[model samples]
Target: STLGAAAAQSGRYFGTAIASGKLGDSAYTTIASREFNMVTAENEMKIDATEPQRGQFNFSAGDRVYNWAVQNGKQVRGHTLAWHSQQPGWMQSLSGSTLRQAMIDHINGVMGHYKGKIAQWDVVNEAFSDDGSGGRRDSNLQRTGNDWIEVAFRTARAADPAAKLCYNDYNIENWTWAKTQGVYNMVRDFKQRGVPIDCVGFQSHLIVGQVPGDFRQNLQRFADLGVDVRITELDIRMRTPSDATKLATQAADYKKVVQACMQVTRCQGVTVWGITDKYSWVPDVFPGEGAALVWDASYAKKPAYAAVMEAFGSRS
Candidate 1:
């Protein structure tokens, strides 16, 4: 689960207990609950995304998390080495060539530090809106134009030869014209140039009963590009205080998402943003939304959890 919440509650926080056997085998565990396997951490890595005013490097949090993953034999997905949000304040002051250099430096520093520790890096995140034409005007990179994506990927590759670089964004369902075309064109260009991009991350943040209409087709189009794909930051939200209908719909959608992953060979794994509804970031971030997880506030398995396991071909 995301943030190691499941592991932490189980008293195996950060792989320590699981690795050392401090937590007994009888402890309730699911594939999602494993700390090192494929888990998500919020904000910690984002902080390291920029340091020292875009020129200087700081690896404190990123290093610690990567070390933990490496030591525990877990694969790490480097979330968002470049994004519009959570960037340092100083980046806003620069422009022209100075901004470009700062952007490159930021990429090199963070990706360089993690290097092999992180198996994949989200080289460029949310570069475009759902329409794909309008960029986030306020974002640091968008203000300079989308070219920063190319620069970021180049710098990331230079930092780590083996780490797979990915372009990640949301709302790919039914192949929304703008998003689908934008990502498709970007991947094609990156491929033609022999860029270091190795994957495409589809942030499957969905609502109850709303699986991306063309999920299979979208995954195929992306995989056909010859790049690995993943459903990163997945969560199916419902109105707060979910009822039987919402819960059931969420379960079906969760299964559909997992099934999409299963259908595509390049689809690596599915990671829910968080383990339980209690700590889900959706309601606070999205407002008036909640119940977007496999487990409930009390850590009890939701029907969505069961549906996911079933889709994964597990009996649970």
Candidate 2:
């Protein structure tokens, strides 16, 4: 069985973020559809990607990935509906009540459009402040001491009560205690107040050998809060040249993440950021690092692929 199939055997999904660029490339799409059991749009589902122009929702790329997932019988996860980034200027430039109303409108339109098709959504992605101990950031969403996150979740629930709404952010993975704890407190407080939040997404964009030992514990705490936990957007990068040693280390790091998620019964799925190194965003974003996926530049499975399979092949 494939990694996703094996993970499903134990009631979990192993998946990756799908992109129009790679889906257009037959070589990339061939293996991606075969390996992943769940899919999330890499960029097309974001506000900027969907609504680049004011009131104009373009779901062309999103629909292509969605149709592919449906044809291949893969589960689909909505990338995001509300975030501080990737929003159009028309939406972002609004102030006070106008800004809040726009957010509500966007979520309603999006969630309603994809209502029955999407299984989960990163309802509010990366909303926390980067300063580690702060709560939600000072985005336009803020309103007179009102919790913008709460408003976002409530509106999302109204749009699609069936979707598993999640709060996703980076730095919450593999130790980074202050930031992780900040998110945890946010979720913990949300639950205490009867917020409709459903899951916590750990965007595990890790370093090659930095997978933390307490990862399972972190997920467990969130699971104990009575919501699912998912490793959404996972990818481990290193300085390039792609040495045998680095590849081996990357494989072990993959195993550690998979194992950590598996240990938490509520850790529902793992989604790699992209399928192959050739199309990875790391090299471009970080300048010197690349080869952060299970497949290499030639559509060939790398050591990380085998290692990931071996990790998921065991009891889920």
Candidate 3:
């Protein structure tokens, strides 16, 4: 997601204010440029349904975004190497063995091409359901079982040993019995078997009133396992056309989430799902909701924007 117009404007104004006072200097530049580590761009990669094979690797969209990151001195989170959705139709025709080989080749090729450039890679995304009892039904991964997840990680590790390989999924925020336990077990298994996993990504997609019940403890537990943790795709939603009360609640929740990250040493970073409300996929995906970010559509700083800055000690 890009920044709301108002928020972008406010960010610029804030930068000016800080610069004039001699306290900001290049910090705003750094924050503005490198604050976010993970970004998603659908259709940009162009791995569409018709062209299922890997021969046509369309890098235009992905390249543009990655170039932006490089120019800005920001790191990249290679969103995903394999997922049933957003894949081409031809992939379905391949047999299990054929598909597995294709999948491995894709991961190795992509990661190899971007080796040293990407800071981390979400080898597999949302591979499992909320309960994590098994893979998503009717999904390619489900049909193939856990082998895909394993292959993606192994291939990625072999491709780029220096980059952090992570397993990313949503709904792990509150550590609900099923979601939390499933992820913990998976990580523990990976550790025991010496899987090349370096981190766990918790997509903290929360509601305005509820923060994770035991966010700190959950983070600490994962950290204790010796793997880094990160808050990825974080956004607290509200009912349609957020009211003043809802906006304030959003700000408070944002503060709480950032505070949780700050307190956890192993929690390396926190990334809002999108930078701006305008480009946010939440509304399209969940119609009627409004203002899921720290800035409004006009790039003006919302309460949440200031709250995040305060939490990060960025605002003077």
| Highest TM-score against the true fold, candidate | 2
Q: Model 3: residues >4 Å from true position, as ranges?
A: 1-52, 92-95, 131-138, 314-316
**Model 2 lDDT tens row, 91-161:** 77877877777777888878888989997899998877777565667777654235778898999998888
Off by over 4 Å in 1: 1-36, 47-53, 131-138, 314-316
What is candidate 1's CA lDDT for residue 227? 95
TM-score of 2: 0.95
TM-score of each: 0.84, 0.95, 0.83
Candidate 3 lDDT, 1-316, residue by residue in tens: 2322222323210111001121133433344553443344333432342134655565555666567555754456676777666777667666467778777777776777778877677777777675455334346655665666777788889999998998888777666557677778888888889988999988787888888768878888888889988777787888778778998989889888876766677887776765556556678877887578765666556788768766665322
lDDT of 1 at 3: 31
Q: Rate the local accuracy (lDDT) of all candidates.
A: 0.69, 0.85, 0.66
TM-score of 1: 0.84
Candidate 1 Cα deviation (angstroms), residue 93: 2.6
Candidate 3 global lDDT:
0.66
